[PDB]
A paper describes a structure:
Recently, an axonemal Ca2+-binding protein from ascidian C. intestinalis, named calaxin, was demonstrated to bind to a heavy chain (HC) of outer-arm dynein and tubulin in a Ca2+-dependent manner and to be essential for the propagation of Ca2+-induced asymmetric flagellar bending. Based on the amino acid sequence, calaxin belongs to the neuronal calcium sensor (NCS) protein family. The crystal structure revealed that calaxin was composed of 11 helices and contained four EF-hand motifs. Similarly to other NCS-family proteins, calaxin can be divided into two domains: the N-terminal domain and the C-terminal domain.
In calaxin, EF1 and EF2 were composed of the conserved residues for Ca2+ binding that are generally observed as D, D/N, D/N and E at the positions X, Y, Z and −Z, respectively. These residues formed five coordinate bonds with Ca2+, including bidentate coordination by Glu. The position −Z of EF3 was substituted by Asp, which coordinates Ca2+ ion in a monodentate manner. Moreover, we found that another Ca2+ ion is bonded between two calaxin molecules in an asymmetric unit. We found that the crystal structure adopts the different conformations in the C-terminal domains between two calaxin molecules in an asymmetric unit: One molecule is in the open state and the other is in the closed state. Compared with the open state, the closed state exhibited the inward movement of the α7 and α8 helices and reduced the exposure of the hydrophobic surface formed by the α7, α8 and α10 helices (Met122, Leu123, Cys126, Leu127, Ile140 and Val144). The residues (from Phe172 to Cys181), which formed a 3-turn helix in the closed state, relaxed the helical structure, resulting in a 1-turn helix and a longer loop between the α10 and α11 helices in the open state. Phe178 was dragged by the movement of the α7 and α8 helices, which relaxed a part of the α10 helix in the conformational transition to the open state and induced a C-shaped groove with a width of ~10 Å. Calaxin adopts both its open state and closed state in the same Ca2+-binding pattern in which three Ca2+ ions are coordinated to EF1, EF2 and EF3, indicating that its open-closed transition is independent of the Ca2+-binding pattern.
Author numbering:
A (entry chain B): 2 to 199
B (entry chain A): 5 to 128, 136 to 199
Write the structure that this text describes.
Amino acid sequence: SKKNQKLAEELYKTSCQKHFTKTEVESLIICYKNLLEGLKMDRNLFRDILHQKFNMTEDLLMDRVFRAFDKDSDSYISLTEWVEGLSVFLRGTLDEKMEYTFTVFDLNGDGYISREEMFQMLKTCLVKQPTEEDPDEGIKDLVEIALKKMDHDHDSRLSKKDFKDAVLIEPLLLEAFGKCLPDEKSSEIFEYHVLGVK
Amino acid sequence: NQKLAEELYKTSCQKHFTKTEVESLIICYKNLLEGLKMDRNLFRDILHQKFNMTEDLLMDRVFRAFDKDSDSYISLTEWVEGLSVFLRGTLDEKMEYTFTVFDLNGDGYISREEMFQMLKTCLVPDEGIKDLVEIALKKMDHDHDSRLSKKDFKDAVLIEPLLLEAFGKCLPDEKSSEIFEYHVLGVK
Ligand SMILES: [Ca+2]
Ligand SMILES: [Ca+2]
Ligand SMILES: [Ca+2]
Ligand SMILES: [Ca+2]
Ligand SMILES: [Ca+2]
Ligand SMILES: [Ca+2]
Ligand SMILES: [Ca+2]
């Protein structure tokens, strides 16, 4: 409490998160500590949290969300990564969110969401829960629809500019390639129970 | 006149135009009219020439959605209300409209066959369409009855955006919209 208030003062000061108050940071620190199994928040713990708290169930996208959280790529979510991540994930502006979803969707980190990446991401839900018949021609149709709507220069990939321009025009395209933000009900429940909002 | 525009702005359910814009739409309608009323043939030519729709099935369904009283003419009020949704519609307005277009028999469920015929006409081969239909049901059919109820469809909004772009071809593309608003309403 003294422990956590002083930690919260320091993290509120140092963290780049833009949306929690210092008291909310303290609640987030306590929550993190209460969720820890071992000393560090690893992939498997973070996966469980996404599944249980945010109803995400699909392996590829959960891994991509983890990687976006894990800013320094050490395969652990630090306290400051937990706050900063959740700040965007729960409260981000469109701008923040578009940068986040682009990062999720750019599977190899080369700066472009490629046709191939689109196909992998769109197919991954049907790998998990298959239709009776192979769905690949229909996925390819969706990929072409995406490219038609979003690829300005017809090079079969979306630059950051391609994606953000299109999402600003149609914000429903924010998560075009899969669910990587919490639905409104999940978000509300976590805010209410963990942060006391509403 | 102006009086029609005063009356229509007061009376109409359209949500997105100003009274001056309404007046512009009334003048537009009258500038385009060929006889006394806008019938299906004229309405189809407008969809074809100004909004880049090419297929008979699609154009018939858009007509029927604009023709709310099913009298086979597009009244001034229908033209304005339909264009309000069509050019500036909210998500809810657009989903309602797209559901209307796709639910061919008007029973309140999009069936597999309705979805296949309408995706096919919207996206003008069949292998991808047949897949799309199975994908949509797998993703959106909550109660597993092989049909999309209106709730099935509307709950799917924030969950399935690219699938909703497929269905959204009954609305005009951004390019066609912009050009019409620019010419007729004086917008960017
Ligand atoms: Ca880390
Ligand atoms: Ca990439
Ligand atoms: Ca197939
Ligand atoms: Ca491009
Ligand atoms: Ca009528
Ligand atoms: Ca039906
Ligand atoms: Ca159903």
